[PDB]
Design an enzyme around this catalytic site. Structure first.
Site, mmCIF file in Angstrom:
data_model
loop_
_atom_site.group_PDB
_atom_site.id
_atom_site.type_symbol
_atom_site.label_atom_id
_atom_site.label_comp_id
_atom_site.label_asym_id
_atom_site.label_seq_id
_atom_site.Cartn_x
_atom_site.Cartn_y
_atom_site.Cartn_z
ATOM 1 N N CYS A 38 0.817 -1.091 0.012
ATOM 2 C CA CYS A 38 -0.028 -0.050 0.089
ATOM 3 C C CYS A 38 0.906 1.205 -0.049
ATOM 4 O O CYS A 38 1.546 1.703 0.993
ATOM 5 C CB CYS A 38 -0.905 -0.143 1.233
ATOM 6 S SG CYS A 38 -1.731 1.485 1.896
ATOM 7 N N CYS A 40 -0.053 3.875 2.718
ATOM 8 C CA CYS A 40 0.490 3.399 3.992
ATOM 9 C C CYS A 40 1.853 4.019 4.141
ATOM 10 O O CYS A 40 2.225 4.197 5.399
ATOM 11 C CB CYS A 40 0.210 2.115 3.994
ATOM 12 S SG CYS A 40 -1.542 1.352 3.795
#
Length: 107
Positions: free
Chosen positions: A31, A34
């Protein structure tokens, strides 16, 4: 250093049974958003010493926890006060935005 690396099994103790506020980061290695917030969490953990603790729970390594909180998109930051979700943030945000999210919801 001050960030808690949470697991499925340790989540109760580290989060639900903690006497105070825990900012949990629900994330995954693939991600992009993230990863962009990860060094922002590092600074938050240093600057908010005494006020809260940052904890991360990678959702591929620990798949159990996130459904219980209805997580359906990452990163998701949950703010807990003594085991109870106070404030939910979905998606990446800046240091100044997270700061404001914390200050407003910690009171």
């Amino acid at each position: 250093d001050k960030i808690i690396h949470l697991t499925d099994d340790s989540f109760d103790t580290d989060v639900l049974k903690a006497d105070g506020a825990i900012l949990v980061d629900f994330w995954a290695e693939w991600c992009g958003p993230c990863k962009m917030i990860a060094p922002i969490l590092d600074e938050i953990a240093e600057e908010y010493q005494g006020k809260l603790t940052v904890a991360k729970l990678n959702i591929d390594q620990n798949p159990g926890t996130a459904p219980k909180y209805g997580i359906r998109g990452i990163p998701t930051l949950l703010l807990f006060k003594n085991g109870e979700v106070a404030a939910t943030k979905v998606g990446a945000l800046s240091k100044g935005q997270l700061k404001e999210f914390l200050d407003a919801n910690l009171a």
